[PDB]
UniProtKB/Swiss-Prot annotation, chain C:
It comes from Mycoplasma pneumoniae (strain ATCC 29342 / M129 / Subtype 1) (Mycoplasmoides pneumoniae). Binds the lower part of the 30S subunit head. Binds mRNA in the 70S ribosome, positioning it for translation. Part of the 30S ribosomal subunit. Forms a tight complex with proteins S10 and S14. This is Small ribosomal subunit protein uS3. Residues 38-108 form the KH type-2 domain.
UniProtKB/Swiss-Prot annotation, chain D:
It comes from Mycoplasma pneumoniae (strain ATCC 29342 / M129 / Subtype 1) (Mycoplasmoides pneumoniae). The keyword Electron transport does not apply. This is Small ribosomal subunit protein uS7. Gene3D superfamilies: Ribosomal protein S7 domain (1.10.455.10). The lineage of its organism: Bacteria, Bacillati, Mycoplasmatota, Mycoplasmoidales, Mycoplasmoidaceae. The keyword tRNA-binding applies.
Swiss-Prot record, chain E:
This is Small ribosomal subunit protein uS14. Belongs to the universal ribosomal protein uS14 family. Zinc-binding uS14 subfamily. SUPFAM superfamilies: Glucocorticoid receptor-like (DNA-binding domain) (SSF57716). The keyword Nucleus does not apply. The keyword Ribonucleoprotein applies. Its cofactor is Zn(2+). PROSITE patterns: RIBOSOMAL_S14 (PS00527). Gene3D superfamilies: 30s Ribosomal Protein S14, Chain N (4.10.830.10). One of its GO terms (cellular component) is small ribosomal subunit. It comes from Mycoplasma pneumoniae (strain ATCC 29342 / M129 / Subtype 1). One of its GO terms (molecular function) is structural constituent of ribosome.
Swiss-Prot record, chain G:
This is Small ribosomal subunit protein uS13. NCBIfam families: uS13_bact (TIGR03631). One of its GO terms (molecular function) is structural constituent of ribosome. Transmembrane segments: none annotated. Belongs to the universal ribosomal protein uS13 family. Located at the top of the head of the 30S subunit, it contacts several helices of the 16S rRNA. In the 70S ribosome it contacts the 23S rRNA (bridge B1a) and protein L5 of the 50S subunit (bridge B1b), connecting the 2 subunits; these bridges are implicated in subunit movement. Contacts the tRNAs in the A and P-sites. The lineage of its organism: Bacteria, Bacillati, Mycoplasmatota, Mycoplasmoidales, Mycoplasmoidaceae. GO terms for cellular component: cytosol; small ribosomal subunit. It comes from Mycoplasma pneumoniae (strain ATCC 29342 / M129 / Subtype 1) (Mycoplasmoides pneumoniae). Residues 90-113 have a biased composition (Basic residues). Part of the 30S ribosomal subunit. Forms a loose heterodimer with protein S19. Forms two bridges to the 50S subunit in the 70S ribosome. The keyword Cell membrane does not apply. Residues 90-118 are annotated as: Disordered.
RNA sequence: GGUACACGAAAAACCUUACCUAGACUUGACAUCCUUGGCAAAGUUAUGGAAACAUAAUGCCGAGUGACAGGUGGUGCAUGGUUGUCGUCAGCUCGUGUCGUGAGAUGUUGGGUUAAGUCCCGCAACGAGCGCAACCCUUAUCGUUAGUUACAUUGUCUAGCGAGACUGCUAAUGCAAAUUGGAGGAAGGAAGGGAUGACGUCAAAUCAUCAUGCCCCUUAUGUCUAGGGCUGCAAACGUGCUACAAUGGCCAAUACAAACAGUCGCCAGCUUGUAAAAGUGAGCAAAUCUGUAAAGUUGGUCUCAGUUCGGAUUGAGGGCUGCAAUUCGUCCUCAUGAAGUCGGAAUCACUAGUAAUCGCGAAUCAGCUAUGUCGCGGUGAAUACGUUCUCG
């Protein structure tokens, strides 16, 4: 037991990369750390932007682009340090970030 | 006067107005930045205020002591309402 | 009028050339302005190695650089000098204390990235090789590596004011609309004594299918 | 060269269990929202039944049946004058025109709450008080004047 | 006259009252948003290539 | 006894509960007043009509919670949820359930707005 | 005020267009001295109307506010300043366009010949 | 004109600002090299000044030398890149070879059949490629997954996967494409949408995304600071944006949030200013803390009216960030109640969530008379004979 409750938020800008990171971490922390829930997700905050195309004229001439986001959550009542010890051997792809809230 | 200040310290125009008042009120100086809001004691002066070409000796009107010198200076010259 | 479905192809059907996540909306601009200089310097400084692409990750002023090249031997060089020069240059360009780790990996049919293709085509155009034969050289460069169908265009100036004389190559299955197509499009702005010339290449990494999601 | 495209409508309203009431609610729908229009039409039917003491549904359907239109026009010119070809219009447009005329003539009074005047106009159109019945009569009469222009092909 | 804007980026704006957002390569001072720090034309053209992390052609 | 279905309409989700009873129909959602929480609509009485072509409306007390949308949004959501819970009772009445657009979710959401189109399809006018 | 004893409708409407009292202040006056916005009243008892006029004059007096507004316009116009020059041209001073906006100040559809010089 | 009208520019008291005036900067405001070092370039309040700038003190390191340094100034017929017109069209290009005496044709066309060169069939034809569909996301029913701060009358909820729907089957009917009916499925006929613009096309526009050959100025198209103008204005057109009103105005009880938005932003909550907001004070880097969802419901009034529509314009009092709110920022409290009571040609969006309507959030930001614009959400119509006038 290390932390009474660790809130790990997985924030990414793709569904596939976030799912890959979630599965990787949930499979590597098991066996060195116990009492961790599965892939618990969070509602996302994907946004859409629209940027003009023509240099000067026709403001209506724009292309639309997506700023996607996808989030998972883990609430670790029981935490072991070794959970992160192996995290550097299966190092997370940079498309996903882990926030310790 | 920012519609929120009746008596506020400008901290960079009070010196000039005080020095001018220290004779009787000697008006003409060379100060024309629109960062200088007038307040109590800023009652009567002429500044070489800028229009865009020249610094005419614009009188800071005593009718209102909050509206700044930029208002008092005519810094526009339109077509003089022509039909063209 | 002239668009390639590559922005949607890169990112939801493929990856980015510079991908990184962040929690703030302010350092993103600084990171995106900073990493482009490193990418451009690595591209221009190393063309004998034909550096296919560079991946940049930036998190909290922490910059990591990965390099994929068509001829990685020139990146290391003889007696392993160029590798040391590259390592020190990249370590210094990202910051005095910024961490850096690099690995050397190759890609199947190495000359399949449109970047080096366009760069070498421009070099051939301005390297005593006539325009038709430079076109053929670029076509061989993409083809002899092991790549699929080729689209090559050279627009701009012929040292004149006419716009109704040029040549262009299309060979094979290049759907401009298929999202899952694995197409690389690159452009080079070459400075000639009469203006700037745009050399554009669309090269198929392979007619990909059943792989429409990010990896 | 658009071909035939089907028309669409919505489900009836329980005040009458008919589609005409709901379509009137759709047409008179202000704020783009049908709750206010539904309330307006419910009060309209209440004021219809409390005036002249006659059942609202038969009154409303008689109004929409006597406002009933039977024509649409295809314009065409010869050299400097344009005349008309009367064409059979689908019944969807016929009932739509009837209901739209009812709705538009319902609110053309400025004296009180809209409830009394919409009720009065529905009553008038049912009792053939000329607000839109004259349009049907004129269409029927000019159906003996535009078929002459329909006959010759210029 | 790009050096005016360049040095104005380098020279300290005496207060936040000098509101302008620019890029180190882009000369325009309009729509160079703080999220990416680059011109709208630059951004859209490089987004046809899909290089910015989490930027793809929008489809809801 | 306690059934629990799902229902959606116009970015509105519903969690429904039905139980075979002998009440009058129990027309209420979120367990509050239908006078003001339910605005003037046609669903305010058409909620328990799908109970008529199924397990009698005297059964299946309406115990529903809502999430999101507008006064007709969660209304359609809860109606679909109640009929989904009805499906759990007698699927062999579905011959008159799917036909009335009850088991069917309309697959309909408000059309996404576009640049230049401040509404959904409306655009600037061209008067001289 | 003190003129125009109400008729044909309630009192919240009568005072909306008399200097110093508008819709909001008419509603406040109605809520203050028990004016009773009932089913329909045209003229209340004449024991409260004296107090009604007294509290309406408590709000800036119509004759007084007419002079106040006129003198404020004159003083903002008599000065030699930008606001004065915008005043004397019958054009908006809050900051507005006078090319096609600023209407009822530039007249309703006062279309003129817009001469173009190349 | 289509193919510039809330364009670039997604916000002007200094900049944004690209112009002008003034003061300043001078191998230079930017800079390099060059010599060479090690504690200062930075920085502060004065002070003349508007600060520029000279200024004194100060806290891994920076500087003089001359080559030269910076260019948004255009030349878009010099262009790259960029999009748009037709048009996301209904077709297009290319090779083999054949047919012509050459231009050229062929296929690629035509009958069936589609949004499509969709395919079949036939034909000197054979195929290769491009555009619409195609992966992609977005969308709905079910099953299922992990489990809080969800649900809890629980694996619902969220986000993850799969099944499922592909005229699929049956009957017509066509050698084929592909149409119709029933039912299954939630969703059936390219299951809703789009992504990408075929050949060109306007040497359209872009020298200014960045530039760019050319010229154009460099102790001066370079640069700092101060200010003003882009919101001037006899005015017009375009768009939104308030209206010309009882679905509307006022009063009173009164629901559902969302792409979701949020770190110095959302700010819970408390108090007060009838008001802009102030004082107090968490939490929220967000499933957590907010961000109210509103219109709509319920009843009463105004009971018809330049009008309980419209605060246009205008001003009195404060409010906001902001050094400072004046030209070139703004909000309410309050007041004038103009014009306009549906508008001449000329018109617009439209095939169900469409027109129509109402709220919310956001980049811009110091600020906003951005009302824009973007995005979301809610509620919720008609019509569509057919291209006949029609244009594409």
């Amino acid at each position: 037991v290390k932390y009474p409750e660790l809130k790990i938020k997985l924030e990414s800008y793709d569904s596939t990369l976030l799912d890959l990171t979630t599965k990787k971490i949930v499979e590597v922390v098991k066996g060195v750390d116990v009492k961790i829930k599965g892939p618990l997700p969070l509602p996302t905050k994907k946004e859409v932007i629209t940027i003009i195309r023509s240099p000067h004229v026709d403001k209506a001439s724009r292309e639309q682009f997506e700023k996607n986001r996808h989030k998972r959550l883990m609430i670790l009542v029981d935490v072991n340090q070794g959970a992160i010890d192996s995290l550097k051997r299966i190092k997370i792809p940079v498309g996903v970030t882990l926030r310790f809230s | 006067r920012s519609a929120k200040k009746g008596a506020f310290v400008d901290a960079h125009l009070l010196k000039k107005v005080i020095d001018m008042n220290k004779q009787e009120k000697k008006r003409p100086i060379k100060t024309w930045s629109r960062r200088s809001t007038i307040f109590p004691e800023f009652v009567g002066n002429t500044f070489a205020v800028h229009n865009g070409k020249t610094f005419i000796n614009v009188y800071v009107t005593d009718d209102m002591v909050g509206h700044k010198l930029g208002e008092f200076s005519p810094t526009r010259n339109f077509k003089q309402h022509t039909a063209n | 009028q002239k668009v390639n479905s590559n922005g949607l192809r890169f990112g939801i059907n493929k990856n980015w050339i510079s991908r990184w996540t962040a929690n703030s909306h302010a350092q993103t601009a600084k990171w995106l302005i900073e990493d482009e200089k490193i990418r451009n310097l690595f591209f221009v400084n190393y063309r004998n190695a034909q550096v296919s692409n560079v991946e940049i990750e930036r998190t909290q002023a922490t910059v990591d650089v990965f390099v994929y090249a068509a001829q990685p031997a020139f990146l290391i060089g003889s007696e392993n000098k160029n590798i040391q020069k590259i390592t020190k240059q990249i370590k210094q360009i990202i910051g005095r204390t910024t961490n850096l780790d690099l690995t050397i990996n190759e890609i199947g049919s190495p000359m399949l990235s449109a970047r080096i293709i366009a760069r070498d085509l421009a070099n051939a155009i301005e390297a005593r090789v006539p325009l038709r034969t430079a076109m053929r050289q670029s076509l061989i460069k993409v083809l002899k590596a092991g790549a699929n169908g080729i689209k090559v265009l050279v627009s701009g100036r012929l040292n004149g004011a006419e716009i109704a004389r040029d040549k262009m190559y299309i060979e094979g299955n290049m759907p401009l609309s298929t999202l899952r197509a694995d197409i690389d499009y690159a452009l080079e702005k070459a400075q000639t004594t009469y203006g700037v010339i745009g050399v554009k290449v669309w090269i198929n990494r392979g007619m990909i299918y059943t792989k429409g999601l990010n990896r | 060269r658009k071909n035939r495209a089907p028309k669409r409508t919505v489900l009836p309203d329980p005040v009458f269990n008919n589609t005409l009431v709901t379509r009137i609610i759709n047409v008179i729908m202000e704020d783009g929202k049908k709750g206010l229009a539904q309330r307006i039409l419910y009060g309209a039917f209440d004021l219809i039944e409390q005036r002249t003491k006659e059942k609202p549904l038969t009154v409303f359907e008689r109004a929409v049946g006597n406002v009933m239109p039977r024509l649409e026009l295809r314009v065409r010119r010869i050299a400097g004058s344009n005349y008309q070809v009367p064409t059979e219009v689908p019944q969807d447009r016929k009932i739509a025109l009837a209901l739209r005329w009812i709705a538009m003539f319902a609110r053309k009074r400025h004296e009180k709450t809209m409830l009394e005047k919409i009720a009065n106009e529905i009553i008038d159109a049912s009792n053939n008080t000329g607000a839109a019945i004259k349009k049907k009569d004129d269409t029927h009469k000019m159906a003996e004047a535009n078929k002459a222009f329909a006959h010759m092909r210029w | 006259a790009k050096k005016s804007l360049k040095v104005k980026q380098t020279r300290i704006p005496k207060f936040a009252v000098r509101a302008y957002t620019r890029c180190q390569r882009c000369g325009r001072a309009r729509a160079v948003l703080s999220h990416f720090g680059v011109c709208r034309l630059c951004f859209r053209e490089l987004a046809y290539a899909g290089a910015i992390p989490g930027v793809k052609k929008a489809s809801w | 006894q306690s059934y629990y279905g799902l229902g959606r309409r116009k970015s509105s989700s519903a969690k429904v509960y039905l139980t075979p009873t002998q009440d009058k129909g129990k027309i209420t959602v979120n367990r509050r007043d239908p006078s003001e929480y339910f605005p003037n609509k046609l669903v305010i009485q058409d909620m328990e009509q799908p109970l008529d072509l199924t397990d009698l409306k005297k059964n299946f007390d309406i115990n529903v919670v809502v999430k999101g949308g507008g006064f007709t949004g969660q209304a359609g959501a809860i109606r679909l949820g109640i009929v989904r819970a009805l499906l759990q009772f007698n699927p062999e009445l579905k011959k008159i359930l799917k036909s009335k657009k009850l088991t069917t979710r309309d697959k309909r959401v408000k059309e996404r707005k576009k640049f230049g189109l401040y509404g959904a399809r409306r655009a600037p006018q061209f008067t001289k | 005020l003190g003129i125009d004893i109400p008729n044909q409708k309630r009192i919240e409407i009568a005072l909306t267009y008399i200097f110093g009292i508008g819709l909001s202040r008419s509603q406040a006056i109605l809520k203050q001295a028990n004016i009773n916005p009932d089913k329909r009243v045209k003229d209340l008892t004449e024991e409260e109307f004296v107090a009604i006029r007294n509290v309406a004059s408590a709000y800036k007096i119509e004759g007084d506010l007419r002079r106040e507004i006129a003198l404020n316009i004159k003083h903002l116009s008599e000065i030699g300043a930008w606001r004065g020059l915008r005043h004397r041209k019958n054009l908006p001073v809050r900051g507005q366009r006078t090319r096609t906006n600023a209407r009822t100040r530039k007249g309703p559809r006062k279309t003129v010949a817009n001469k173009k010089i190349e």
